[PDB]
Design a protein around this ligand. Sequence first.
Ligand SMILES: CC(=O)Nc1ccc(Cl)c(C(=O)O)c1
Ligand SMILES: [Mg+2]
Lengths: 412, 412
Amino acid sequence: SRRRVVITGMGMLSPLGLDVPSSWEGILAGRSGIAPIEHMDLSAYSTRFGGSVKGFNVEEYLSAKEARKLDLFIQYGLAASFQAVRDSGLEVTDANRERIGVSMGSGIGGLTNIENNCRSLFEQGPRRISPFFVPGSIINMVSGFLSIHLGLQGPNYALTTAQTTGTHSIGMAARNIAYGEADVMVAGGSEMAACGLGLGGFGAARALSTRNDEPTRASRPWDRDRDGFVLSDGSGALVLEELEHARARGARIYAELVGFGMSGDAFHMTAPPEDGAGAARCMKNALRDAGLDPRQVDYINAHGTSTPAGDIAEIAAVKSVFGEHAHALSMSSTKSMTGHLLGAAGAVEAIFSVLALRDQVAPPTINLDNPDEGCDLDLVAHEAKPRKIDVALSNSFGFGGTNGTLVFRRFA
Amino acid sequence: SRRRVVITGMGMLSPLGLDVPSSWEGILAGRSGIAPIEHMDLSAYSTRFGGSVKGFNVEEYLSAKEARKLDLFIQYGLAASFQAVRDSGLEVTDANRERIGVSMGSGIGGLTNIENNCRSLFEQGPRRISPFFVPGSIINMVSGFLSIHLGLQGPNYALTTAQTTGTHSIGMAARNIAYGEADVMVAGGSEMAACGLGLGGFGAARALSTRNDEPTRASRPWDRDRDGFVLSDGSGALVLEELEHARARGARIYAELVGFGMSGDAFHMTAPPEDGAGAARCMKNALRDAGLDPRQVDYINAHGTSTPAGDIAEIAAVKSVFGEHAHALSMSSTKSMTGHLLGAAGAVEAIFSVLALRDQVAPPTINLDNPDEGCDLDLVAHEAKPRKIDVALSNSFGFGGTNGTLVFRRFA
Ligand SMILES: CC(=O)Nc1ccc(Cl)c(C(=O)O)c1
Ligand SMILES: [Mg+2]
C-alpha cells in the first residue's frame, strides 16, 4: 500500500545547456553538444572530443572558497540539485527538514581531483596533498554538501552503479517516499570524467568513438557505422515528492513516477549479452512495479550508447518485452546529441522522459543515417516526432551487468 | 506487510584475520591488528602504521589472471562475499537466481589502482593506462563481479556513504527483502585506502593518530590521550534472507535484523556536532523501526573512531536516547583492535554485533586506560564481558553528516 510519487522540480548541466530549458531546446532541435575538448591537451589521444559543460559559473551557486574544496563532479551535482530545489518552490522548515533527503550519485567520481593531487604527491611528496582532498573528492559529498547547505535531515546517501547510477538514484529515492521514509528527495547524478585517466582509461579499452574529423556525427546509436560511445560531463537532479504533500502546498507537478525496475545480467564485467536478457528482465520488473501492460508504453528513452553490442542488445530486449507492440512505441537515444554522461546519463534522460510527456514529443535519434541489421523499430531518426505519450520508460545498463528502468506517466 | 529478515551467513577480511572465526577470536582476546605498514615507504608521512590484511591469498577465490585486473578493495569484497555465501549454505539455481541480489559498497573505492594508473599516465603516457582501469577501479564492481561468479540476477547496486557505507548497505539490502524486491541479499562493504593519497589525504586533515612508536596503543576510543583514528583495510559481507525462505531450506539463523535508521546531521562536511544530535535522531529512528523500548538494548557496537570530537559526541547521543538506561547497557568500540575500516567498518562491526548475540559477550574496548571527562558508561574497558544480550545496536557516522544504525535481535 505504497504512496504515489511525483516530480515537482528538475535541474541540469549538460553538453546542450546550463539548465533544463536550454538543454531541452537543443534536444528538440536535434543539436549536438559534442565538440573537440579545449580544457586539456589530447593531441596524442585516439579520441579528442566529447560533451563538455560550456561556460559553467560555479559562483552562481558557491563561494570561491567552497568551490576550491570540491571536485567538478560535485560542483555539477550541486548546481543541478540547487536548480531542482529552486524549480520545485519547496520551503525547508524545522517542521519538514527531517522528511527531506538526498541521493545524488556518480559512476566514477573525483578523477580530476585525484589527478591533481597525484601531481603534488609524485613531484613533492604527501605534505602538499590538500587537507580537503578526501571530503572534496568522495562520491557522497553532493548529498553531504546539499544537506548541510539546505538543512536537509532526511535519508542522506549516494549510489554508485557506473552508467546506471542516475536511474538507480531516482528509483531508490522514489521507494524512500513510497514507503514513508521521506516526503521529499533530491535525486540524480553527476559526472566529470574528461581528464587523461577518463579518456585514457576508456581509450585503452577501445570503448570510445574515434571519429575526430566529425565529432557531431560520432554518437550514432543503431547506425551501421557506429564505433563506440562519446564521453560527456554534466548532472541531473529531480525533486521527488509524495503526491498529497505536493498537492497540499500547490506544487506544479511535471509527471508521476509509477515504476522502477532493477536486474543483474550476471554475464560479463563490461559487455551485455547479445539478446539483452537482463535488460528485458529489468523493463518487465519496472512494468510489473507500475501495474502496467507493456502495450501501455508509448516512448522509451533508450540507454543507446552507440556501442556495437549494446545498441543491438537493447533492440532485442525491447522486442522480447513488448512483442508486436515494439512496432507501435517510439524509442530514441538522446545520447546521439548529448553523448554518454555515465553516472549522470540516467538523471538527464529521466528529465528528457518527463519533458517528452509534458510536450507530447519523442526526441530524435540524430545521425541514424543507415540503421543496422535488426534495428527496424521506430527509432525517431533525425527529427523530433510529436505523438501521444501517456507512459515513458527510461533505461540505463552499466558495467557489472547492473540494469535500471524508470517508468513515468502523465499526471492529471 | 513487511517481511522479517535474518542473517544466515557472514564473511570477513580484517587486520585480525582472513575470515570471521579468526577475526572474532582476536576480538575476544583483546588483540590489536595494528602495525607499521610494510607495503609502501611512509618515511615522509606523519602516520606510518595502520590495520593491514595479512597474508591474503586471492587465489583461494579467483584466478591470478582475473585478480591482476582488480583493485584490492574489490578483491577484499569478493573474498568476504564468497565466504558469506559459502557460510549460508545457499544454492543458486534457475528457480531462485532472480531473487538473490548484492549490495557491496566502499567509501573511497579503488584509490590504489587510480594512483598507480595516474603514475603510469604522468611518467610514461596514456598508452600505459590499463584497459581494465575503469571496471577494475569503480565501486559497483564488487556487486558486479560477485553476480557474474555466482549467477545472482536480483537487485545489483552499491552505496558509497564514506564511513557509513557498510551500515547503509546492510540496512537498504534488508529493506529490499522486507518489501519483497528480493528474498536474499549479499550486503556489506570493503576498503583498501592505504596508499599515498589515502594516508596523505587523512594526514593533511590531521585526522589520523600519529602514535608511530606504539601503533597497538594508537586506537584508544574514549581514552583521554586519544589523538585521531587508525586507518585499516578489509571487508565484511552478510547473507540477508527472508525468514520463511531461510526456514524452508533449514538455514542456520545467526540473528534477526529488526531495525534500521538513517539521518543527516546537516552540520559539517567532516565534524560531528558535539551533542551527537544526528546520531541520536538515527538511533531513535532505528529503535522505532524495530518497535522497541530503548531499555531493551543490551549492547552497542559504537562507531568509536578514537577522534576527540567523535567519541564524546557518541556518549552524548547514547545518553540522550537511553537516559538512565545508558548506565545499564554495554557499549564498546572494536576499532580499538581493528582500527577504522572506513566504508567496511559498518560491515565488520555488524558481524561483531551478530557474534555478540550468538556468544552472549560484549567485545572489549582495549587501550581505555583513563576514560575522558563524561565518558562514564560501561565501555567494556580492556576485557570481553560475558553478559545477557537480546538486542545489539551497531552505529556508523560519516563525512557529509551521514548516519546509520542497525538493530539486531536474538532469533528463537
Ligand atoms: C541492452 C543492454 O543490456 N545494453 C548494455 C549493457 C551494458 C552496457 Cl555497458 C552497454 C553499453 O554501454 O553499450 C549496453
Ligand atoms: Mg590497537
